[PDB]
Amino acid sequence: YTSRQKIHKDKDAEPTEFEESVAQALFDMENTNQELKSELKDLYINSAVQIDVSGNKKAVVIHVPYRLRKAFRKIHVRLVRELEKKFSGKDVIFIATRRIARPPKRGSAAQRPRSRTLTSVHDAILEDVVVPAEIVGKRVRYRVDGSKIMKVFLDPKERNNTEYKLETFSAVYRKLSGKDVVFEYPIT
Amino acid sequence: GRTLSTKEADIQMMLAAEVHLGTKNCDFQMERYVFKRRNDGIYIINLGKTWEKLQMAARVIVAIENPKDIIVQSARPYGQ
Amino acid sequence: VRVSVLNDALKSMYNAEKRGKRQVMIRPSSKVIIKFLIVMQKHGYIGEFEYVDDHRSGKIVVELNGRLNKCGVISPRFDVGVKEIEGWTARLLPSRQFGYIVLTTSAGIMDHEEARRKNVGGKVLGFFY
Amino acid sequence: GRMHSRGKGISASALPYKRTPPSWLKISAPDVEDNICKFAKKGLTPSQIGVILRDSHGIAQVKSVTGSKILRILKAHGLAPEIPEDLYHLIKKAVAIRKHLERNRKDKDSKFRLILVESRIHRLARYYKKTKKLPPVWKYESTTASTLV
Amino acid sequence: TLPNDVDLLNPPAELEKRKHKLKRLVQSPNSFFMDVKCQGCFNITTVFSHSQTVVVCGNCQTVLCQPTGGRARLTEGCSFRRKG
Amino acid sequence: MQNEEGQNVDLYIPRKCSATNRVITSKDHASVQLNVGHLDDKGLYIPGSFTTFALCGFIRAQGDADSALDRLWQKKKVEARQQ
Numbered sequence: 262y263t264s265r266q267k268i269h270k271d272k273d274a275e276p277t278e279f280e281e282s283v284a285q286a287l288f289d290m291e292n293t294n295q296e297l298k299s300e301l302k303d304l305y306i307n308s309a310v311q312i313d314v315s316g317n318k319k320a321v322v323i324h325v326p327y328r329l330r331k332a333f334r335k336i337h338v339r340l341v342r343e344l345e346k347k348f349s350g351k352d353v354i355f356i357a358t359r360r361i362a363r364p365p366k367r368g369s370a371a372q373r374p375r376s377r378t379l380t381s382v383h384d385a386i387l388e389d390v391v392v393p394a395e396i397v398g399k400r401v402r403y404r405v406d407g408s409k410i411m412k413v414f415l416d417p418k419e420r421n422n423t424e425y426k427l428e429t430f431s432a433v434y435r436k437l438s439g440k441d442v443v444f445e446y447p448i449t
Numbered sequence: 450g451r452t453l454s455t456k457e458a459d460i461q462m463m464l465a466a467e468v469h470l471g472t473k474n475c476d477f478q479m480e481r482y483v484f485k486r487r488n489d490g491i492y493i494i495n496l497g498k499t500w501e502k503l504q505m506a507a508r509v510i511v512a513i514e515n516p517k518d519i520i521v522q523s524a525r526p527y528g529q
Numbered sequence: 530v531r532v533s534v535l536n537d538a539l540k541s542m543y544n545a546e547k548r549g550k551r552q553v554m555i556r557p558s559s560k561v562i563i564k565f566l567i568v569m570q571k572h573g574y575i576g577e578f579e580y581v582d583d584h585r586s587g588k589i590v591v592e593l594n595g596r597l598n599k600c601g602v603i604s605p606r607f608d609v610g611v612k613e614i615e616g617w618t619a620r621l622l623p624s625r626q627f628g629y630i631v632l633t634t635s636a637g638i639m640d641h642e643e644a645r646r647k648n649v650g651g652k653v654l655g656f657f658y
Numbered sequence: 659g660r661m662h663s664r665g666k667g668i669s670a671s672a673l674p675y676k677r678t679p680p681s682w683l684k685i686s687a688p689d690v691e692d693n694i695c696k697f698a699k700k701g702l703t704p705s706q707i708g709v710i711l712r713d714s715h716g717i718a719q720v721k722s723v724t725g726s727k728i729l730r731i732l733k734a735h736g737l738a739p740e741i742p743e744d745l746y747h748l749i750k751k752a753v754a755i756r757k758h759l760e761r762n763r764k765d766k767d768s769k770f771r772l773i774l775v776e777s778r779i780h781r782l783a784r785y786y787k788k789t790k791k792l793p794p795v796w797k798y799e800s801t802t803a804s805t806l807v
Numbered sequence: 808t809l810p811n812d813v814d815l816l817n818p819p820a821e822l823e824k825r826k827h828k829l830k831r832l833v834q835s836p837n838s839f840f841m842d843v844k845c846q847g848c849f850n851i852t853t854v855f856s857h858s859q860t861v862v863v864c865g866n867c868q869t870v871l872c873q874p875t876g877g878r879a880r881l882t883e884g885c886s887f888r889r890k891g
Numbered sequence: 892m893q894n895e896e897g898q899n900v901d902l903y904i905p906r907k908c909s910a911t912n913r914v915i916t917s918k919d920h921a922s923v924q925l926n927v928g929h930l931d932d933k934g935l936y937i938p939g940s941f942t943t944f945a946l947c948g949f950i951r952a953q954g955d956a957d958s959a960l961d962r963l964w965q966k967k968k969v970e971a972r973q974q
């Protein structure tokens with residue numbers, strides 16, 4: 262089969278050139294690499310986007326089906342390290358696709374699951390962005406000027422894997438939810 | 450050789466004089482200056498903070514234009 | 530039992546400010562409490578405050594400037610129209626030059642001067658000065 | 659404080675901030691549900707099942723691995739008891755107190771405690787009737803309470 | 808400690824450990840899981856530090872711990888390693 | 892306090908506690924004002940140069956004046972290059 266099977270855009274939309282490039286990269290990863298050949302046969306991405314994080318640096322965010330989030334997680338590290346070498350120093354982020362439902366209008370009898378609330382989806386996205394790190398604390402500081410800055414504490418165990426991705430995580434989260442977040446490692 | 454600094458010699462003199470030996474009780478507002486409690490129960494005073502406070506008191510005293518406006522008194526016989 | 534978390538928060542801040550503490554702890558947290566604190570901070574009556582996540586109602590640590598004379602809750606939350614604001618301010622505030630009454634209107638939680646500006650009524654939450 | 663005393667104790671559990679299972683744990687959610695169902699079939703209440711799992715199988719919190727509470731899992735498999743466990747234990751205590759009082763008419767302290775326990779039973783039963791965990795016709799009667807258990 | 812001498816958001820670890828488990832800035836338990844091994848059997852079992860039940864090794868049918876008021880008391884032969 | 896034109900109207904501007912920010916009143920005879928002298932590179936006092944701290948009676952009666960003054964002096968010395 263072709264690489265088009267690795268990309269499934271919503272409503273069968275036509276992907277851009279970056280989606281095609283990422284799908285091709287995944288296809289060659291499945292084919293050439295034997296260790297990941299078994300895992301990647303039934304894995305496809307919903308969409309792929311590019312976000313700039315700093316001068317002369319950029320990051321690529323890949324959205325994957327919700328039902329395959331566990332499968333992607335169990336192979337996250339190898340896949341990210343293999344894909345990074347192909348984009349010339351661009352970090353790769355996997356975020357499961359989720360739907361946000363607006364609150365029911367006042368007086369309506371419609372009920373919305375709490376998982377579909379904006380806050381729950383934002384928390385899930387924040388949990389997914391720092392993979393493989395695990396969040397161990399959260400602080401929100403309300404500045405005098407009226408701005409909010411959130412501090413997220415990550416487990417030091419994944420320091421070697423996450424330390425260099427902090428700025429990319431901040432930029433990606435800001436783009437995805439418009440929230441200012443900083444990452445720090447507890448001292449101990 | 451290795452000549453000691455002024456603070457080093459001052460703290461050595463304080464140790465020789467047993468300036469760091471507190472009592473068995475600590476005031477809650479004097480705790481910030483106490484280093485730790487020894488097994489006996491006598492609190493050990495942090496001599497670095499003592500030296501810094503001595504310097505601060507000297508800074509305050511030196512700024513008084515007329516020394517005759519300063520009064521120093523001791524109730525106990527030892528400090529007279 | 531706990532009936533008004535906002536009352537507990539404001540009373541803790543008032544007691545700490547009277548004692549001279551630089552920081553105070555508010556537990557549990559609430560979005561009404563956060564809005565009240567933001568209104569207070571907008572007018573320079575408090576410093577930066579930080580929300581602590583504990584997978585529960587939460588906690589807040591507030592920096593105290595030393596400018597807060599008294600912050601208090603009003604219970605029960607009486608209905609205040611746009612025409613009753615003058616009487617409520619006369620009852621509650623030390624002067625007409627400073628001090629604020631916090632209301633909860635359909636347009637959001639705001640001080641009484643903004644409520645007069647927007648011509649919106651609601652319910653009285655508290656006061657500070 | 660306590661509902662029917664002046665005790666002000668604050669002893670309780672302190673759930674960890676981490677909601678995910680520990681790395682060393684390897685059991686799967688369907689396996690945990692299977693053990694829970696087996697224990698329930700053996701005649702164990704959700705509290706007992708949780709205690710056994712924590713103390714023996716290294717499952718600190720069932721919700722962490724399964725994603726749902728023990729009683730929810732039992733109900734999903736048609737294994738939840740007809741009456742809730744806490745109300746069952748309260749009724750058992752009331753029955754024991756009444757049985758003791760049958761032979762001790764002078765034990766006025768037991769009478770006081772029976773009054774308190776039956777007040778608790780009635781309040782809990784009212785709550786469970788509001789939430790439809792008991793049929794509307796359900797009613798606690800001291801005369802035939804022993805039959806219910 | 809005087810209130811202005813400490814930060815409520817950055818308390819020293821010693822103070823946080825000394826505080827009651829529920830009175831810490833973020834609640835955290837004092838219990839833990841341990842890997843207990845019998846003296847003679849290579850089998851390894853996970854035991855809660857405050858076990859309320861008498862944990863028995865399946866192989867040799869030997870009691871590993873005894874419930875107490877607080878932490879469970881292990882049998883003299885057995886040894887434990889902190890699992891976490 | 893100022894008039895609409897902009898004229899100063901108050902009789903005087905009272906001092907404020909360096910630690911508590913409280914207003915120091917005219918009859919507050921427990922309040923103190925302290926000057927901490929500055930030192931040059933040779934550890935010599937520079938006449939006329941010092942940091943001024945004022946403490947109200949309320950804080951001093953509480954016994955917290957010592958720690959508050961220590962903290963304030965530490966911060967001000969860090970800012971003023973007095974070490």
Ligand SMILES: [K+]
Nearest residue numbers: 660661662663
């Ligand atoms: K009671």
Ligand SMILES: [K+]
Nearest residue numbers: 667668669670
């Ligand atoms: K208890």
Ligand SMILES: [Mg+2]
Nearest residue numbers: 532533534559
């Ligand atoms: Mg409410």
Ligand SMILES: [Mg+2]
Nearest residue numbers: 660661662663
């Ligand atoms: Mg009652």
Ligand SMILES: [Mg+2]
Nearest residue numbers: 659666667668
């Ligand atoms: Mg209590």
